[model samples]
Target: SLVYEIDGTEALGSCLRVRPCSNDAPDLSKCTIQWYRSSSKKELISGATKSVYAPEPFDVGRVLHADIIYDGHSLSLSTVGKIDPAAGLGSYVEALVRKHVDFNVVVTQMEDHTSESIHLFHVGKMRIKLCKGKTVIAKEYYSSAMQLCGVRGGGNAAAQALYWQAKKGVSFVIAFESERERNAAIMLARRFACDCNVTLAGPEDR
Candidate 1:
């Protein structure tokens, strides 16, 4: 009897180890292994014939499977897993804003002549909310289907607000508590480039 299994748990950051056993301790060297990216449906991973494999960033919420064939016998294993890297400051800010449904703070320009920038300060950082006239709007998160249309620079001449458009071209803007948070948001939006258009504003464009 031959037994084949994946020797790793289906968790983020975990590596996949191929394990094949037999009643007589079969020679694994005699077997051939093949790996595939399940989301693409039959997309074979070239040169992935080893006993161990590591996943990549886009592998999040995807499935991986492998096949082991030997002497007219074949074994298959499949796994569904997600990828969630460590949360950075930007992620923390997003989480905090979401936690406090009614949280709003104000910030101001560097010249300090007579400008009012509404901001939300939490923990140790200050994130400004971008507004149009007196209306405030920022979503907790958006789907990849949405497009990032533009970016707005705020205090210290860094990106502080982001503009996004839906598939229908309906647009909206979101303000971050700080420039760091703003860049973080942009970084996140860029990840959806594969599914939609994401624009980053340059110095001259700002």
Candidate 2:
């Protein structure tokens, strides 16, 4: 009978050897071996013997990874990050919806600041700010629905809109304004673009 044929989280130190406890026999053989796995499920080892597999002194959940197929039968420690890592909405959404949801989402810039000149490039080993502008508004870190990029009167009227759009994962949402307010909107647009590092373009530039 196999002694250690059970799946469990084991530490290198706590496991006890059964050979020493077994009745010492030079050539004689009269030992019935059995393997017992200690868990809430009360499941026997695969080969079913009287031997219990225990981890060594220190090894238990520290290093050994466990996976119990049947829920509640065993405690399974699946892949987990070592410490508190910075996992944004991307990670959490993917993890929670894995194998359950079918959707494709892509993150896009609220506005490209390339032409208005607020671009960040890696010069040498440092990132250098180029094409600085006064309109682009740096967006918040979180994603939200109903994102607006520029306001009709100028400066980040759309920033809030963009934030909401990001949160909702919308393809794109534009803030429609009256033609009469286009100039003021352009002024605000310039400010928003500058604050957020977006390249300003379109009829407003001309």
Candidate 3:
């Protein structure tokens, strides 16, 4: 690895100017100097002459498949493919990415919280049992009772608790930020039983 050290208030340009006379210039002949022309293609950069550079150099150098500009310079041992503006980026240049908001909504079920022995149920582990629109399917399930034997930290046991409670027909559970937002969502068989109108009731603790 190589390390660089410099004094305060000294610019790299100044350092390069004095490089030929510095102890670091022992192998100056091995150094290669080159210049890049910006968009205008009229200006050239040299050791003593600092000039304005712009996007033009980037466009021209990319077309030639050469890293003739700083932006195109590859710091890695391998090279990266170039971006061609003429080929176009389709819709990606303006594409919108989904920004999800994390939250926990307490779905406090209307049923008695203490009525069922939810732990004994064996079939309702963390499994995705819900479906979305006609073509989208989503499934999730809770973990097993054995999983819940220790501290809960949004792990399998927590998921199992939700699945079992849902199976046991519990009314509601508090939606905490973790534990996938404590007991909050419920399913009304008629509305979401079909494959078209379902989505995992998301967390509400944003």
Candidate 4:
């Protein structure tokens, strides 16, 4: 087994860079480097075998560690890097909403009166679920072939004034604390409709 110390520093382009240090001058020809999202969990990172690694956007929100393997023995190193949660959230949402991309829903703290929180998202179908904080407690799915039995929007002074509903009787309103949050959600919904096989509920579309 090889003994090594792991170190990390913020690299150029706002990414984490990790490298292993060793004083024994281990034989590189017979040794291999393996990177992981964690030391305990050991989620092996695909293609991250080099001595030095630069994190990418998809790597956000993960703590990184590495292992050195030689002669059938393994030496594990502690965490050497981490990605900030805020930046990670942005990158994660960006990837989820990109053109022609198909991915699972990004759960959030956002919610409606029907539930304390929500897993309001679309994949092959539109889904809305009751959530307890970041965790889901209950859920439902509205498929692509689902229809809107009733449609209404643009109310008067009684409410905030904009809302939409689907055939399954799920409704969503725009009352975001920030426009950016609202816009991002809209982009995600748009992507879900296009990328997933889900249909958007609208009077004219029916």
Against the true structure, what is each candidate's TM-score? 0.40, 0.17, 0.16, 0.38
lDDT-sorted candidate list, best first: 1, 4, 2, 3
Q: Write the per-residue lDDT of candidate 1 for residues 10-114, one digit (tens) a residue.
A: 543346677755666366667788766555465565545765655433334567787878888887777645433423644654564333222233333322324
Query: Where does model 4 exceed 4 Å of error?
Result: 10-20, 27-29, 85-194, 197-206
Error of 3 at 194 (Å): 47
How many steric overlaps does candidate 4 have? 0
lDDT per prediction?
0.47, 0.26, 0.23, 0.44
lDDT at position 19, candidate 4: 39
**Candidate achieving higher lDDT, 2 or 4:** 4
| Residue 69 Cα positional deviation in candidate 1, in Å, after optimal superposition | 0.9
Ranking by TM-score: 1, 4, 2, 3
Query: lDDT tens string, model 4, 1-206?
Result: 37676655432123232333566747644678876664346566654566555443223456767677887888777554564333344565676654432222322212634333333333222553434356654444545633321112111211111133533455444233332343344445534655556654433331
Ten-residue region with minimum lDDT total, candidate 2: 121-130
lDDT of 2 by residue, 1-206 (tens): 11112232232212322332134222112334433323323223332222233321111223322222222232223212111212242343334332211111112244532223222211111111112233322233222221222221112222221212323343232222321122222233333444455444321211
**By lDDT, who's the top model here?**
1
Q: In angstroms, how far off is 87's CA in candidate 3? A: 4.0
Positional deviation of residue 163's Cα in model 2 after best superposition, in angstroms = 50
Ranked by TM-score, the better of candidates 1 and 4 is 1
